[PDB]
Amino acid sequence: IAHPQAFPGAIAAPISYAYAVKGRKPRFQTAKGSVRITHREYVSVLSGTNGEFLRNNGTGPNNDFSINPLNPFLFPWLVNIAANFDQYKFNSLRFEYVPLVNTTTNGRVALYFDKDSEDPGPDDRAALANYAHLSEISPWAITKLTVPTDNVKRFISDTSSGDPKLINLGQFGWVAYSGPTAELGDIFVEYTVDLFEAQPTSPLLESLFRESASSVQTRMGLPYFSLEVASATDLVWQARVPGTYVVTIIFNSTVGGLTPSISGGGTINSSFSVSTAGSSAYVANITIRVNANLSLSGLTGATNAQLFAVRAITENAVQVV
Amino acid sequence: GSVRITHREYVSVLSGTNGEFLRNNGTGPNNDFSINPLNPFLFPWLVNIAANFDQYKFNSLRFEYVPLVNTTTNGRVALYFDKDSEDPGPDDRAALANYAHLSEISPWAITKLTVPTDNVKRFISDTSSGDPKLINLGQFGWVAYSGPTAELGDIFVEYTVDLFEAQPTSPLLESLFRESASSVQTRMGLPYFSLEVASATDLVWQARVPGTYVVTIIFNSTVGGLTPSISGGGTINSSFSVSTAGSSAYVANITIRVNANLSLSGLTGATNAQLFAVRAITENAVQVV
Amino acid sequence: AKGSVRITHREYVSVLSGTNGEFLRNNGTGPNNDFSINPLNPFLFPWLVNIAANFDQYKFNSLRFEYVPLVNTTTNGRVALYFDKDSEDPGPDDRAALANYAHLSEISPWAITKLTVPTDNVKRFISDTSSGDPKLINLGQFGWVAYSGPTAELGDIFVEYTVDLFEAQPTSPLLESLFRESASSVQTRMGLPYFSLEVASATDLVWQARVPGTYVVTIIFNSTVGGLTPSISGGGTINSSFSVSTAGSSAYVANITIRVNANLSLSGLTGATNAQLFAVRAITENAVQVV
Amino acid sequence: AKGSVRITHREYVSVLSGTNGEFLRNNGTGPNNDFSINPLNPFLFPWLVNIAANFDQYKFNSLRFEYVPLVNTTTNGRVALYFDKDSEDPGPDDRAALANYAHLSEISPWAITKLTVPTDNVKRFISDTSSGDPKLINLGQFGWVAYSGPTAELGDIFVEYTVDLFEAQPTSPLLESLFRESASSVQTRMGLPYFSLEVASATDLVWQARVPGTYVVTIIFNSTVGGLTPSISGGGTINSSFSVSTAGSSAYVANITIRVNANLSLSGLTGATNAQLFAVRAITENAVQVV
Amino acid sequence: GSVRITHREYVSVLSGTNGEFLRNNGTGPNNDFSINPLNPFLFPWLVNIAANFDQYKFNSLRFEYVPLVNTTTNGRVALYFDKDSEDPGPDDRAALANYAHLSEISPWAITKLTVPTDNVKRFISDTSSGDPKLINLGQFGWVAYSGPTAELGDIFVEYTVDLFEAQPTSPLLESLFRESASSVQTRMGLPYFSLEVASATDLVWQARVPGTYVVTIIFNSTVGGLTPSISGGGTINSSFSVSTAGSSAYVANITIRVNANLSLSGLTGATNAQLFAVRAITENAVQVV
Amino acid sequence: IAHPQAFPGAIAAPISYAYAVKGRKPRFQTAKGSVRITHREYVSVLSGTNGEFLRNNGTGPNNDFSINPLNPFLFPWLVNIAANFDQYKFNSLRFEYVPLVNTTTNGRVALYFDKDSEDPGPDDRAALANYAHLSEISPWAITKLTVPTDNVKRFISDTSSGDPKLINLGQFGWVAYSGPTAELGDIFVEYTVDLFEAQPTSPLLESLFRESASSVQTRMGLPYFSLEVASATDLVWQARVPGTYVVTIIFNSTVGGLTPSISGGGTINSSFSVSTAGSSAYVANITIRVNANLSLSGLTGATNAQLFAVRAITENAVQVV
Numbered sequence A, F: 001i002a003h004p005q006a007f008p009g010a011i012a013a014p015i016s017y018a019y020a021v022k023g024r025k026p027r028f029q030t031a032k033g034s035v036r037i038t039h040r041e042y043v044s045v046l047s048g049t050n051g052e053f054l055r056n057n058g059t060g061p062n063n064d065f066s067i068n069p070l071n072p073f074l075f076p077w078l079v080n081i082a083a084n085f086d087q088y089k090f091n092s093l094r095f096e097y098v099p100l101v102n103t104t105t106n107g108r109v110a111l112y113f114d115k116d117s118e119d120p121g122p123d124d125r126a127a128l129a130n131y132a133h134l135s136e137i138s139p140w141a142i143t144k145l146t147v148p149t150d151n152v153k154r155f156i157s158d159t160s161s162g163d164p165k166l167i168n169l170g171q172f173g174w175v176a177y178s179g180p181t182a183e184l185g186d187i188f189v190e191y192t193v194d195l196f197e198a199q200p201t202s203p204l205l206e207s208l209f210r211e212s213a214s215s216v217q218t219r220m221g222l223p224y225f226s227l228e229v230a231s232a233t234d235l236v237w238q239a240r241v242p243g244t245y246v247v248t249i250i251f252n253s254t255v256g257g258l259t260p261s262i263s264g265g266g267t268i269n270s271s272f273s274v275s276t277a278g279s280s281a282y283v284a285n286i287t288i289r290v291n292a293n294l295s296l297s298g299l300t301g302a303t304n305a306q307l308f309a310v311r312a313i314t315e316n317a318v319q320v321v
Numbered sequence B, E: 001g002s003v004r005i006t007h008r009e010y011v012s013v014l015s016g017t018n019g020e021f022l023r024n025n026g027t028g029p030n031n032d033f034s035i036n037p038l039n040p041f042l043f044p045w046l047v048n049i050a051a052n053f054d055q056y057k058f059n060s061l062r063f064e065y066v067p068l069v070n071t072t073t074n075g076r077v078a079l080y081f082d083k084d085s086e087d088p089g090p091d092d093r094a095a096l097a098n099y100a101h102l103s104e105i106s107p108w109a110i111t112k113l114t115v116p117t118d119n120v121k122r123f124i125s126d127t128s129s130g131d132p133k134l135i136n137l138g139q140f141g142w143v144a145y146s147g148p149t150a151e152l153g154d155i156f157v158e159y160t161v162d163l164f165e166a167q168p169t170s171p172l173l174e175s176l177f178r179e180s181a182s183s184v185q186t187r188m189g190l191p192y193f194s195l196e197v198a199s200a201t202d203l204v205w206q207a208r209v210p211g212t213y214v215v216t217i218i219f220n221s222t223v224g225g226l227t228p229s230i231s232g233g234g235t236i237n238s239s240f241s242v243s244t245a246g247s248s249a250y251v252a253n254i255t256i257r258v259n260a261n262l263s264l265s266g267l268t269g270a271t272n273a274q275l276f277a278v279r280a281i282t283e284n285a286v287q288v289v
Numbered sequence C, D: 001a002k003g004s005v006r007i008t009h010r011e012y013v014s015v016l017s018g019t020n021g022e023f024l025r026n027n028g029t030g031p032n033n034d035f036s037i038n039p040l041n042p043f044l045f046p047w048l049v050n051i052a053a054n055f056d057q058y059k060f061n062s063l064r065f066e067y068v069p070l071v072n073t074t075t076n077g078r079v080a081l082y083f084d085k086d087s088e089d090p091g092p093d094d095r096a097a098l099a100n101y102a103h104l105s106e107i108s109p110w111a112i113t114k115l116t117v118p119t120d121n122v123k124r125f126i127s128d129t130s131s132g133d134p135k136l137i138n139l140g141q142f143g144w145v146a147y148s149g150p151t152a153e154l155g156d157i158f159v160e161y162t163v164d165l166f167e168a169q170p171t172s173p174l175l176e177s178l179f180r181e182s183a184s185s186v187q188t189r190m191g192l193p194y195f196s197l198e199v200a201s202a203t204d205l206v207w208q209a210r211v212p213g214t215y216v217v218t219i220i221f222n223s224t225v226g227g228l229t230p231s232i233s234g235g236g237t238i239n240s241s242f243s244v245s246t247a248g249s250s251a252y253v254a255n256i257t258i259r260v261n262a263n264l265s266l267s268g269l270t271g272a273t274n275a276q277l278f279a280v281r282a283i284t285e286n287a288v289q290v291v
């Protein structure tokens, strides 16, 4: 109470803001035709690096900042339920940013939304302003971006099922420019979805395959991992969704073996490999963070690689060698 | 909220050749003729505004034909519209008639084609991007048969659109690049020019969209040298070149009015080439030489 | 009316910056000409310009500039936004002048403030802010000052507005053609004033960037061999580059992401005379790919 | 509307058949592509197709599939009709999957049941069910299963509906052109998918019939003499036949009454490469009469 | 108070030349075509009345094209209007279409262009005087492309104006003078004629505004002598000359119908020249000789 | 809202105060006999230097901290109006200090007023306390000093028109001791004046003249500039009122030329000089700040100097050389 040597109308700067977030139970109810879920999930931490215009942290705006739900990155918990249904319609959708940082911090954090599910980046701070659905604040403050929800059922689907403009509501994205190099705030999402048409459960595994020589890569299932380097010397996959996985990787080298590592944040808990001839196989129980890499290095004449990833817990350990 | 534009602009010159059922001037029912505000072929003017938005909805849409040709001209021009953006197009003059939305007249007379507007927002997008059935209101086309072989008339589009949801401006230039050697070519921005031939000997680009441009062509040659020429309805107004071994650069202010090619042909041992094109005017003249 | 389109939007003006122990009006830019409210002015309205290039007349219904801090809470000093109805009057030189402006707003750099300029009821022409009498074509002048603070980027200035545009016309050029000579001094410019010409020697060519953003530049000139010396004497990033230089003829194309008010320099020139700049606005994936 | 025609009708889908001690979804056909509800799909809508070939868009107002037993009252087992909104999702593999479908109907083979699929309010395109994104063009997917029964024809499945069609266009081809090579592997198809190509060897040519009915087929290919070996490896009747075969060039035309999902086989081939099928639908009095 | 005139009068003949996108007959979008009552180019009749007033406001404004040419003529004529009095004009036929106010037809047919009148009084003034954006409603223009090379049609202006505030009559003659040597030339009054060449050898003036005039040309020669000739659509009806050393005088009653020049050509060693022009009729014939 | 681990009665220190100042339109109205103006103008920035007892910034308390109005330093805008009148009477008069600085700053800023228009300085912090009209605060705070207004018309006049005690209401002044070396706050003045007796407009130029040998210097007009050094080698004038001027300087040296510069904050925009014999003349278009110097150096045997200063804008540039 009571602030020194001040006239009213003054605005007084504190040194830091604490906002307190508590756990939130989900609400289900059936609107006669639809099941309706309200819940709050954790999107991602929002970081910036110094002297960079850092868009979506590292990453950049791709196809798993697409709203559909069914999207492990945006809706970790909801994915499981949504797999049991054929189509969805968002009622309310809000992204909320809770500062991680004190008010001497400085810089800008901004949240944006665009209806073009596969809208490219805002290229710089000036472009970033042109969005219709934008929130720009100091990193030490709190804010929230409300996404306009339309009134049309679209299919619940992984981003590898025809035109993303048909299945996804839009795209979420953030930017941090100026400012320090740090983790600036939490990004939560509050939502209310209606799910329609119960069906037999969609699979929640990932199947990412490349050839070599044809140069195309094909993905089915959820985008847990992404393929970043082709090569015949190296194979690197990148974690898009933090968590523990049991990944199975099979490929065609010409003899030699492989050298696995986790560049970035992550640990390998249980390796097993068998590599020879023109066939190699590596199955592992990894825990990994967003934008970390699982690299298979020291390869020699490697074409044709396929990855199978499923969510597990650390204790689903590989036991042979 | 939304903005609403009402305007009339230039589509293309409608030509026919003798003894030939000739659709879309010989291009065939391409991707060029899909109705979408980011498509500079039908909307050279609108595209500047559409670049700033995400969605569109047409409220009114007409195409118009105004004769360049005189009253003793034989023949037929027809304007049509199919709701299916990737409709094949008609083969004979009898199939041409089955369209719901058609206008046939003598080539020396005016006619309008009124296309049915629906009530669904679709995405403003480059026509070779999303599912054409999802993003385009449909395709527009024309046919000219029973002689002669001339540039028959001008075609205008007249519309009223609502544009929704502002976004950062989609690029209003073209960046078309090819190697040579990998046979792949990537286009960025509006499809003003296409790349037609890429040999070590010659380099030609076809102008799809009529108007005045500033172009920057840069390529990897060896010894190089080059010779600019506009094949057809075109004109170089201001020219600049610099050509040595390894790399050469051409900068020009040109005006194209039909599918005219511009050719860089004196080339010896060339590979990578890139085109930059942007809608300009004649007083944006190159002046260095 | 129904040749009348009406736009409501919020876009990016500029970054408000200060230098330590200086007044610094408009980031030190100076010539209060590219701060005239016409729109059309790609400095104030970088998003509206693509639309207004297609029209002859404009009327603002509401117009408001907004300052959002980039700087932290312990920062000292003061930023100020002002507006004069006379787009031709010179800026404020001292703080005493700044305070007499009828439409002024000042707050400490870590806080948010805004300025609402008053709109009248007259249609004016969308034109160059150099294409005739300022008082006939511009609603007025905008500007900012930052004093007694540190030397840094203090905040972003946005503009929010609702305009009516009238009378569709063929598009004004959305690119820049900037020509110079040598042998003369004449410096004719055509199109938007994205870049300006600081000096054209025979040793060096310097273009200063009046408008933040990503571009694709084509610069062409007459020297006597040499050339290759490109650099950004400000905050920017030559994201893609192509050069070719021989005798009395050389050419440079590049995909720079210039910003605030940076700089473009061609250093190793030797015996240069004629020169010309071609600027268009692009993203980065419009990247040059030949070398 | 008045480019809008509205049709109400009941036509023949297919015969529902089972094999003893098997699951047997869609008679064992497999590729859940020719069971997409577009209409246009000559499997589901063999009567509507002649109309819908003249239009660009469709909207279903009511749609219902009906099972009428062909089998007697002591027959054991169970038939099941299902519908998924996602025309692209794979079929049910086990009975457990079958049961989770929201729109499902199961009854013993000697009884009558029916399934009412729910119609929405959106216009979609009449197209190939291979001419682009399934979810954009198809209302959904239909399918059936017959388990724990005998191995026989259990019943007829009819579809009853009321559609609006919109936008008259020039007619989509009501015939089939199916080409193959040798020397290659490319197998381009054009028109309705009446027949499919199982194998093109050099010894044998086998076309499987996806659509029950009476046809007039023209098959043409390149061998090195031989040819004459026509047969129906299913339920059907070559009602009329004409053959001619010499060197690298032979040709077969015939008025088959193929059905359920029968087969067409050219056996005695020798050194065959290119081949092409031409299918049109006809009666039987369209009988070939030259030999 | 105010007066209100409704009238129709002659603007200019609209011509095209073959294989050429030809605007405003070749003059280019000049100062001539600014819409203002004191501008004898668009308002040869109104100008007599406007001379007596200070301000004007158009209530109605249309331009009209009536074909001089027959039905087998190919081509295009377009009438346009831009609100910006100093609009550059269109470069190609595609930019031409972007105007809000345009009319394109076959050259053998009638067409009208209705220009939007606003509600602001502006000053009646000579068009090269005040800021063109302040004093002119806008510019009118025309283009003719796709052949042939003829005088295609007549152009009329039809309007209704309110004129405000009477003033002493602005001069209804021209006084164009040049020296020679100083390169400066001063015009006074209506811009009927322009001075095109001023050498010691020859002296030509171009008639901008169609009609019949009486002209008085006087110049400083040395020994002099002179030869009158009208280059193009023109005619001398009545001629008088007196030419000695030091100074000579020409008085003529002429009729001009397009941009025709009249040439005084036999000159030897000439400098200062002045032209006096006034709208007359044929029976105002010169009779002394 | 809500402060951590606190009992009521606590006083909580923020880290900085933002006060927001907006533009203020002037109000005119006639009290039957007088015109009455209410407005807010910018006096000066208030700075202190470290380890100094800094009184009136550099300067020191002279005759242009005198209240009269008619005083360019105290009333930039009002001067123009006041020139059209013969006498004035202040109704309300308040000086307001708005902090420029955060609350870790420390030191003291003080505002004082004294009726003796030509009261000398407070000599030290102890003397500064003895004023009756004083406000002492921390530099990070806001405050205002209300000047007692009497009820007597006095003449509107520049400080060079007889006894300053007759024409000026009093003297304003400030002090900053202890504390850092920085610009601490803005000083605004809010006022309501009555102006009486319309007359033909008083001149608003400056005429400052010195001789040499007589040693006296005489000023007419406004105190924009002041003469600081006599000399025969140098002439330095000092800006008392920030702004752009067209200054004309004429003097008697013995041949030689002159070397102009602006020591302190300021730039010269357009010079012209002609210097010879026993006469020299320099006219310039300068922009200058408070307490900067316009020096004419490299002089040689210089007696007798006169300055003419008028306010201009930068574009009134001298065009000859």
Ligand SMILES: [Ca+2]
Pocket (backbone or CB within 6 Å): A114, A116, A119, A120, B053, B054, B167, B168
């Ligand atoms: Ca977008």
Ligand SMILES: [Ca+2]
Pocket (backbone or CB within 6 Å): B082, B084, B086, B087, B088, D056, D169
């Ligand atoms: Ca079609």
Ligand SMILES: [Ca+2]
Pocket (backbone or CB within 6 Å): C084, C086, C089, C090
């Ligand atoms: Ca002013």
Ligand SMILES: [Ca+2]
Pocket (backbone or CB within 6 Å): A086, A199, D084, D086, D088, D089, D090
């Ligand atoms: Ca499914």
Ligand SMILES: [Ca+2]
Pocket (backbone or CB within 6 Å): C056, C169, E082, E084, E086, E087, E088
């Ligand atoms: Ca214009």
Ligand SMILES: [Ca+2]
Pocket (backbone or CB within 6 Å): F114, F116, F119, F120
């Ligand atoms: Ca005292």
Ligand SMILES: [Zn+2]
Pocket (backbone or CB within 6 Å): A001, A002, A003, A012, F001, F002, F003, F012
């Ligand atoms: Zn508090």
